[PDB]
């Protein structure tokens, strides 16, 4: 018989024996009979049953049989202990399959979240919320998640970004926070947490500076968990970002008033975020040939802001900005929320219907590698505002891009921006305390068995000498190889 049916057979037989005792056998024979049958049915086949059935049964999520299995195994002495192992080893075996394979990166977290929810459910229903199984569930996840350095943290970080992004309208407010709570129960198991911040911080940096966050209340909810989970020190730099966005809007009120008081206000409607350089991701400043009307707008602000706060210096980030360019096409006007590079390059495509890749480059000054990325956004994208000559996906130095005056698009407003030392010491005294007498050779052997890192012979001897000085250990009067426990 297979294990799932066999357990039903054992469940049946025990109750018959339990039924017999009430029927005609003396009650004093109640216990020895049950232990006798129980020993033979399960006590002699614990490993055999678990190997054959448990690993298969767990995968199928067969709730009743496991409940029967755990209920039955508790009767045997050490039966439950045997169930922890093959259940625990199952996690480290099937768990490693989730993380070890780099080809499953796109579908990593959801498996980890799903597989996390599954095993928790088995604990709540089958194993009767046994605290021992809860611990080894936590201890086991901590192990295999960390068999891949620094990638699970990256994917969990990337996962939370997707959930919070404005594109995540499908998950309502109540649904979202429950998802995060399951992540935070998973984020605990990671060891390289300092790598999670930088990946979550860089993503959170993009979220604020392009306003794609779905719910500000969901944002603040997230940090309220990290701050509670890792202290204000871990999330200190993060909260600085939110202040900067909060503070920037205040600056806009005062700055905008200044321009109104001035009779010379450019048609360009301006907004600038002021971000503390220490917290935000490091950006490399890069020069761009801004227009004479463009260069002025920073100058009034820079002087204004500096005039309001001495000792500061505003060094601009042209990369992170984005402007709007209303266009005059042949079938209606369109708007293009475009980064500064796209703004400057797209401001090279009206005087002449087209220009060479190099003709634009010295006009603006962008790096070639990123200018190509910009131009690809203007030619190869869905909103093909350029016609590449020759046509193709990738840009080349010989390209004479042609402005698309026949540009058609459904929306009116469009976007293009898609593109060990003490450890040795502690063990030595610990081992020698139990022994009360030992030689050098065995003391050296047990260390590597008891220490999980390399130990140099030179380093090992030095600790022994240091411990001799502190009276922890003493050599034999005639056998330097042999030590004795002092206290």
């Amino acid at each position: 018989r297979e294990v799932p049916e066999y357990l039903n057979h054992v469940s049946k037989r025990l109750e018959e024996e339990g039924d017999r005792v009430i029927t005609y056998l003396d009650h004093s024979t109640q216990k020895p009979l049950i232990a006798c049958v129980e020993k033979q049915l399960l006590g002699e086949h614990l490993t055999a049953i678990l190997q054959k059935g448990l690993d298969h049964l767990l995968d199928e999520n067969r709730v009743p049989d496991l409940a029967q299995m755990y209920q039955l195994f508790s009767r045997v002495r050490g039966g439950q202990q045997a169930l922890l192992q093959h259940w625990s080893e199952y996690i480290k075996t099937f768990g490693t399959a989730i993380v070890i394979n780099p080809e499953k990166d796109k579908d990593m977290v959801q498996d980890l979240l799903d597989f996390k929810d599954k095993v928790d459910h088995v604990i709540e229903v089958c194993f009767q919320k046994n605290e021992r199984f809860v611990n080894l569930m936590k201890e086991s996840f901590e192990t295999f998640i960390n068999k891949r350095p620094n990638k699970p943290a990256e994917l969990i970080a990337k996962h939370v970004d997707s959930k919070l992004r404005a594109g995540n309208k499908e998950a309502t407010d109540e649904e979202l926070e429950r998802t995060l709570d399951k992540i935070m129960i998973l984020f605990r198991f990671i060891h390289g947490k300092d790598v999670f911040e930088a990946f979550y911080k860089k993503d959170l940096a993009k979220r604020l500076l392009v306003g794609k966050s779905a719910s500000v209340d969901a944002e603040k909810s997230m940090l309220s968990k990290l701050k509670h989970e890792c202290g204000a020190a871990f999330t200190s730099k993060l909260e600085g970002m939110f202040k900067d966005m909060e503070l920037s809007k205040d600056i806009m009120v005062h700055f905008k008033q200044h321009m109104q008081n001035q009779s010379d206000s450019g048609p360009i409607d301006l907004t600038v975020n002021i971000l503390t350089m220490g917290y935000w991701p490091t950006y490399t400043p890069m020069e761009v040939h801004l227009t004479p009307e463009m260069i002025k707008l920073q100058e009034v602000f820079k002087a204004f802001y500096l005039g309001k706060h001495s000792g500061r210096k505003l060094q601009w980030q042209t990369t992170l900005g984005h402007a709007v360019l209303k266009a005059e096409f042949k079938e209606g006007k369109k708007e293009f929320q475009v980064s500064l590079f796209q703004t400057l390059v797209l401001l090279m495509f009206n005087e002449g219907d087209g220009f060479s890749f190099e003709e634009i480059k010295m006009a603006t000054g962008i790096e070639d590698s990123e200018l190509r990325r910009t131009l690809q956004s203007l030619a190869c994208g869905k909103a093909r505002v350029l016609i590449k000559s020759p046509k193709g996906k990738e840009v080349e130095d010989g390209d004479k891009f042609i402005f698309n005056g026949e540009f058609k698009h459904k929306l009116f407003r469009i976007k293009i921006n898609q593109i060990r030392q003490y450890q040795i010491d502690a063990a030595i005294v610990r081992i020698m305390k139990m022994r009360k007498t030992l030689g050098h050779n065995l003391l050296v052997s047990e260390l590597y068995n008891q220490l999980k890192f390399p130990v140099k012979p030179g380093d090992l001897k030095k600790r022994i000498e240091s411990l001799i000085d502190r009276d922890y250990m003493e050599r034999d009067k005639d056998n330097p190889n042999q030590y004795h426990y002092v206290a």
Partner: protein, 146 residues
């Protein structure tokens, strides 16, 4: 002032000193208890000596009354557990913060000055025979610090 002590407490909780630890004993923030782990390569190795800080009502501009609770063998520290640092009585400086006074005490555990000693009885032993000093201090550490 409290706000000075609050800032010290927060900046100590965030970035603690290596072999030091101090925090309020109860509700009253003016009464801290600290702990100087014995500096390595010293007779005080492996020791944990508990202090008892008391901040005055003008703490930035007036020293705190730190006093050992664990009986320490030292020429500069009496059996009552009182210290006699010059920085702590005469040359107190507001810029010096509790994380710094504790570290300075930790350093001075290994750098006594038997000249002008608070305990001349031990100072004579230290000045004359340093070999016996490193054994009496060791036994005091073992019988109080561990």
């Amino acid at each position: 002032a409290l706000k000075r002590i609050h800032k010290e407490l927060n900046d100590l909780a965030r970035d603690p000193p290596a072999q030091c630890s101090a925090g309020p004993v109860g509700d009253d923030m003016f009464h801290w208890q600290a702990t100087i782990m014995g500096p390595n390569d010293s007779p005080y190795q492996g020791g944990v000596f508990f202090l008892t800080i008391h901040f005055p009502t003008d703490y930035p501009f007036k020293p705190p009354k730190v006093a050992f609770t664990t009986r320490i063998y030292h020429p500069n520290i009496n059996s009552n557990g009182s210290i006699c640092l010059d920085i702590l009585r005469s040359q107190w400086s507001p810029a010096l913060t509790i994380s710094k006074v504790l570290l300075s005490i930790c350093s001075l555990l290994c750098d006594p000055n038997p000249d002008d000693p608070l305990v001349p009885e031990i100072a004579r032993i230290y000045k004359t025979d340093r070999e016996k000093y490193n054994r009496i201090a060791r036994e005091w550490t073992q019988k109080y610090a561990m």
